[PDB]
Structure 1
Amino acid sequence: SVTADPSPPTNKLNKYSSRITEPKSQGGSQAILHGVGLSDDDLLKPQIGISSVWYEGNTCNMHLLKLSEAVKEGVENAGMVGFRFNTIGVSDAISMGTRGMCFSLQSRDLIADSIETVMSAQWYDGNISIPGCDKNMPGTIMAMGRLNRPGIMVYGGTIKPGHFQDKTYDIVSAFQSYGEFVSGSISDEQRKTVLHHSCPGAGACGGMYTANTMASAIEAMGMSLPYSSSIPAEDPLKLDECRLAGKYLLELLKMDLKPRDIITPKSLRNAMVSVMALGGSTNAVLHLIAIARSVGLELTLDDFQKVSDAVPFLADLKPSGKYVMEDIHKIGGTPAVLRYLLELGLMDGDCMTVTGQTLAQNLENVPSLTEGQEIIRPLSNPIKETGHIQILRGDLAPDGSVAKITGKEGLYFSGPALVFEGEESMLAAISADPMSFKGTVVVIRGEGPKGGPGMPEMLTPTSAIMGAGLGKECALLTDGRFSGGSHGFWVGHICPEAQEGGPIGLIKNGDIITIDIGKKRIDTQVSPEEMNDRRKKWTAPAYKVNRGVLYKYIKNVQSASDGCVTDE
């Protein structure tokens, strides 16, 4: 029983805004509303909060004001009042590699707080959110779940791949350019050319990374309109979707079809099914748990393992494959993918969606995957018989951990631990003495929600390992997160994190660590009694901040196995 936001004061379409538009005792409210341009007749209409995440310093978000204007126009075209407002967001592509990354994950929870705040204070009847980026998307859904007022999330759209001189690039090309330069693979001028053509325009990062994972998952959950996740950012049809969201939201107000009517155990499973089938990001574990909690439901790591075991990986999409979200768009979009998964019996078609109809009804007449397409494998010949996402426990991750397992890595890794108290000291060690890493289980700890602080996503450690030729010769463990595609036994989200005294914070250099994918365990040769000896002598490190938004995060955040929720 979630208690968060104001209740409305049955067939009324302005259930909330009537609190301030109708009583004479709210004459001050009505005076403001006339001052912002509402007529007496406008005061009778539903009021839609239109929350975008526009900002100019990221390609994923710089276009969203234009989208928000189209959403407002369509809300007015549907007989409603549209009130635009706008939250913050941050760019992982900009902050990756820097301590700015400590601020990224928590911006999800701040976006949720932001939209909840405005919708509650202004008494809006419904919400249309326009995220464009990584964390923006689940933050908007969490606010929707807390408020439980009719809402639709309009994905801003993925960016198109960059093209120059018969070469094709994305943000990962730009990430990888430094290492290829240092290795001698490319010249400084080729490096510079990659940076000028990797990000050609607006839109979220282009492969099946976190943004496309979550947009697809949220469409599969029924909380975006069909095709929202797969229409590209700069596409004319994205603007048309914006101009239609008001029509759809009107119908949701008439039926009073709310987020907790749409986000259910079965539609959460539908979202998880799309993550497994498409090879989506391990970050979806954090965000789908957070979304489930926001509507008062439960979702555990073991629920992810069960769906992973039930759903084959079918999609030849970056990072693990070759294609990108624009290629999905060209062969029928996300609805064509979900139609195939539904036909295979992998999804529950009875779930209500923001179209006002069920998932099966949305998908009944959509064009199917284009004949001859090579992106989505048939069930008979999947890329992997089960999903990439694997939950591991064992001695060193007793409360869980998350890995992306392709099947190319083998079933076991065993090696002496090489332990670093953060990303910076690992990178200096691999720079000075790369051969000391050969055969080791590398542990980068102190990078969890409280220890980091902020659970930063880390990319430099793994590109340093790949560039040293050590990809098949070591394993990587962290209480933080690893960015992009895996190329080995790379395990993140290890719980309890080191800052909390979890076993990962008790590992010492030379401890033999064995990762067993089949048993789903990360174990240590150190005896349980010696581990307990170390725990008795362990003292928590001082927090790295004492003020500001990150210290509030330290005070509030739950574990990664609990989705790093902050409001419980």
Structure 2
Amino acid sequence: KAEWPRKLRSQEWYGGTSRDVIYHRGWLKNQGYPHDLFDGRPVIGILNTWSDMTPCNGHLRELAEKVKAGVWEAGGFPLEVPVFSASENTFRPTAMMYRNLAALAVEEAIRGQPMDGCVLLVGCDKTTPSLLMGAASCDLPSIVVTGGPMLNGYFRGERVGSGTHLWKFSEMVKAGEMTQAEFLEAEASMSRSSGTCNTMGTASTMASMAEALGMALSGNAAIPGVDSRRKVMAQLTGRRIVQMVKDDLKPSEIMTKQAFENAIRTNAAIGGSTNAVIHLLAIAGRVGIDLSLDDWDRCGRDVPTIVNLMPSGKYLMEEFFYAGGLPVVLKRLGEAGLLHKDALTVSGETVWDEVKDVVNWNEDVILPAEKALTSSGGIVVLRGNLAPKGAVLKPSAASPHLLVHKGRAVVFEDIDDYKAKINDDNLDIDENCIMVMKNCGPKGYPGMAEVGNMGLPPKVLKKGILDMVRISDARMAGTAYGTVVLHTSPEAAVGGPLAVVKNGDMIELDVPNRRLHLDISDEELARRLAEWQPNHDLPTSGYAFLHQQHVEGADTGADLDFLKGCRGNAVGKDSH
């Protein structure tokens, strides 16, 4: 470890008696700080994604105060810094488009200001990855505090998740099976405490990825946003980041290729969102680890999903927490040759040393190896002429008889074409057809929306059929079922083969052999591709234009090309 005492980067702002420093120090003193706070003790930036418009993060200012208390206790100097908050439930066209913008803004807010370490206060879907991406591109000691999930929803005395019962309550408000005064009580019971989606959606998955990567204190992922112990862990986190600054325990020493592999296997074990694939690839591209879609494939194999939570299962995050949460799961991976046991965490201990003594307190929700939901619930990476740079599928959430399936393509040229055609009873489609949607990726939608879980055509569900093969260049909510191929790359909008799929074309899906094949000749594919031109709207100005010019494919994390890698934390030139 590094020498303590030493001159930290904040002392470039706050150390000495040159005119430069009495400007910086004397200005900050107008908020009323004792002079010894500028003596070179660690200055801790608390990066807070709280916003009134990101209700998933509604309690994060209370957590900031707990962090602050911990920094004070440990003799640091805490400064809260709000950062761009990309909420999935408010941002249009899709929060995924603004993740890279939050990451840019976080990076520059870190490097450009006198902070020595970082607490990443996160919660809603895209906050966790964008803060880790921006923090990783600076490589100052950083630690994640997770907001935590909402409590269980109870409407009429039954367990309702968040986003699950969106179908029944909209179907019933129009089909007259409930009042409007009945419907307002129903909505008020789905999201009834501060916090994130309480299924194994993107928020729960990314909190789990943060803890499994070792970037948060052990136990961080599953505490309800509203439990006392979430405040406790916030204050302990504030104590810890001061020591981490002294020791210079940097993210590049935590997010090693072995830690990413631990996260991949944890994603399998928890049945986590397919969004974690895109985000971990993006975070690794900031740290500078070589991580690929193929790493997701090889490390995901033969890891049973063990947590019995919707969508894949029965319970919600509350129960996952009361059973011991993510540590119990990490133990089991360690008891099976799947965990890299000696991976360093932010506590200074190894992941195995943190988890090895925890007890599973409800085997109904953290299942024994025998009663697991799937024996290989990792994500699979399909390749072929239709996805030359790769596509992903969650086999746990699929239908056995459709894992190997060939069928004829019904094509939707974009999201509007899909909504026009799907419910139309004139559409030529049966259950062996393969639904194919284009122009839904990063550049195409724009922003790669969660439209990949296309709803089946009404004339197909009338037969009592619940699943069909669907392919697109889009994403999918962590909450989903069905045999869905996602993140098809290159996306249609950049001229990938998926752009030139026509109705009637034969498509073969072969998951056991990781194959996804468009059954046309190489000549016909070549001539269809040479004829291609970008049919979607091209922005001419604004951030939309920037994203259109610079976003990459979901196969490498869908980052902006000029933002890949780590640019360090060197202090910039002085402003006077």
TM-score for both structures, normalised by structure 1: 0.92
CA shift for structure 1 position 474: 2.9
Q: Does residue 109 of structure 1 match 2:100?
A: yes
Aligned equivalents of 1:93 and 1:497: distance in 2? 24
Aligned equivalents of 2:464 and 2:496: distance in 1? 27
Q: Which residue of 1 aligns with 2:54?
A: 58
- SS of 1:531's equivalent in the other structure is helix
Q: Check conservation: 1:453, 1:544, Cα contact below 8 A.
A: no
Aligned mate of 1:172, from 160, 163, 166: 163
Aligned equivalents of 2:79 and 2:69: distance in 1? 11
Matched residue type, 2:100: D
Q: How do 1:358-369 and structure 2 match up within 5 A?
A: 358-365=350-357, 367-369=358-360
Could you list the per-position Cα deviations for residues 405-432 of structure 1 after superposition, in whole angstroms to 9, with x for gaps in the alignment? 1253323222221111212211121122
- SS of 2:261's equivalent in the other structure is helix
Alpha carbon RMSD of aligned pairs, Å?
Answer: 2.3
- SS of 2:55's equivalent in the other structure is coil
Q: Which residue of 1 aligns with 2:557?
A: 563
Q: Does residue 160 of structure 1 match 2:155?
A: no
CA shift for structure 1 position 19: 0.9
Matched residue type, 1:404: K
Aligned mate of 2:503, from 489, 509, 529: 509
Aligned equivalents of 2:426 and 2:304: distance in 1? 37
- SS of 1:48's equivalent in the other structure is strand
Q: Does residue 328 of structure 1 match 2:323?
A: no
Q: Check conservation: 2:410, 2:434, Cα contact below 8 A.
A: yes
Aligned equivalents of 2:107 and 2:296: distance in 1? 28
Q: How do 1:192-203 and structure 2 match up within 5 A?
A: 192-203=184-195
Q: Check conservation: 2:304, 2:374, Cα contact below 8 A.
A: yes
Q: How do 1:239-388 and structure 2 match up within 5 A?
A: 239-365=231-357, 367-370=358-361, 373-388=363-378
Aligned equivalents of 1:182 and 1:471: distance in 2? 25
Which structure is richer in relative contact order (CA contacts within 8 A, separation 6 or more)? 2
Matched residue type, 1:92: E
Matched residue type, 2:35: D
* Change beyond 3 A, Cα 1:464–1:125: farther
CA shift for structure 1 position 475: 1.6
Aligned equivalents of 2:519 and 2:446: distance in 1? 29
Aligned equivalents of 1:54 and 1:498: distance in 2? 35
Q: Does residue 16 of structure 1 match 2:6?
A: no
CA shift for structure 1 position 88: 2.6
Q: Which residue of 1 aligns with 2:518?
A: 524
Aligned equivalents of 2:24 and 2:46: distance in 1? 19
Q: Check conservation: 2:123, 2:207, Cα contact below 8 A.
A: no
Aligned equivalents of 1:246 and 1:234: distance in 2? 18
Q: Which residue of 1 aligns with 2:443?
A: 450
Q: Does residue 395 of structure 1 match 2:392?
A: no
Q: Does residue 141 of structure 1 match 2:132?
A: yes
- Residue range with higher mean Cα deviation, 485-494 or 342-351: 485-494
Aligned mate of 1:554, from 540, 548, 552: 548
Q: Which residue of 2 aligns with 1:37?
A: 32
CA shift for structure 1 position 487: 3.6
Q: Does residue 404 of structure 1 match 2:394?
A: yes
Could you list the per-position Cα deviations for residues 102-137 of structure 1 after superposition, in whole angstroms to 9, with x for gaps in the alignment? 341132222222221111111210000111110100
- SS of 2:79's equivalent in the other structure is strand
Aligned equivalents of 2:5 and 2:392: distance in 1? 46
Q: Percent identity?
A: 31
* Change beyond 3 A, Cα 1:484–1:151: closer
Q: Check conservation: 2:139, 2:251, Cα contact below 8 A.
A: yes
Aligned equivalents of 1:272 and 1:62: distance in 2? 29
CA shift for structure 1 position 376: 2.1
Aligned equivalents of 2:126 and 2:65: distance in 1? 22
Q: Does residue 28 of structure 1 match 2:23?
A: yes
Aligned equivalents of 1:434 and 1:130: distance in 2? 50
Aligned equivalents of 2:202 and 2:456: distance in 1? 19
Aligned equivalents of 2:144 and 2:368: distance in 1? 30
Aligned equivalents of 1:183 and 1:488: distance in 2? 26
- Residue range with higher mean Cα deviation, 336-345 or 324-333: 336-345
Q: Check conservation: 1:445, 1:505, Cα contact below 8 A.
A: yes
Q: Does residue 81 of structure 1 match 2:74?
A: no
Q: Check conservation: 1:454, 1:550, Cα contact below 8 A.
A: no
Aligned equivalents of 1:64 and 1:419: distance in 2? 44
CA shift for structure 1 position 65: 1.2
Matched residue type, 2:278: L
Q: Check conservation: 1:52, 1:68, Cα contact below 8 A.
A: yes
Q: Which residue of 2 aligns with 1:5?
A: none
* Change beyond 3 A, Cα 1:467–1:180: farther
Q: Which residue of 2 aligns with 1:483?
A: 477
Aligned equivalents of 1:377 and 1:319: distance in 2? 16
Matched residue type, 2:162: I
Could you list the per-position Cα deviations for residues 326-361 of structure 1 after superposition, in whole angstroms to 9, with x for gaps in the alignment? 111111122122122212222111111111111122
Matched residue type, 2:433: T
Matched residue type, 1:494: T
Aligned equivalents of 1:322 and 1:480: distance in 2? 27
Q: Which residue of 2 aligns with 1:419?
A: 411
CA shift for structure 1 position 388: 3.8
Aligned equivalents of 1:192 and 1:118: distance in 2? 41
Q: Which residue of 1 aligns with 2:421?
A: 429
Aligned equivalents of 2:238 and 2:359: distance in 1? 27
Q: Check conservation: 2:274, 2:478, Cα contact below 8 A.
A: no
Matched residue type, 1:536: A
Matched residue type, 1:461: M
Q: Does residue 543 of structure 1 match 2:537?
A: yes
Q: Check conservation: 2:223, 2:229, Cα contact below 8 A.
A: yes
CA shift for structure 1 position 272: 0.9
In structure 2, runs of 5+ residues without a counterpart are: 565-576
Aligned equivalents of 1:471 and 1:288: distance in 2? 35
Q: Which residue of 2 aligns with 1:4?
A: none
* Change beyond 3 A, Cα 1:512–1:254: same
Aligned length: 553
Q: Which residue of 1 aligns with 2:568?
A: none
Q: Which residue of 2 aligns with 1:118?
A: 109
- SS of 1:60's equivalent in the other structure is helix
Aligned equivalents of 2:5 and 2:57: distance in 1? 35
- SS of 1:109's equivalent in the other structure is helix
- Residue range with higher mean Cα deviation, 22-31 or 152-161: 22-31
CA shift for structure 1 position 542: 4.8
Q: Which residue of 1 aligns with 2:212?
A: 220
Matched residue type, 2:31: V
Aligned equivalents of 2:462 and 2:211: distance in 1? 40
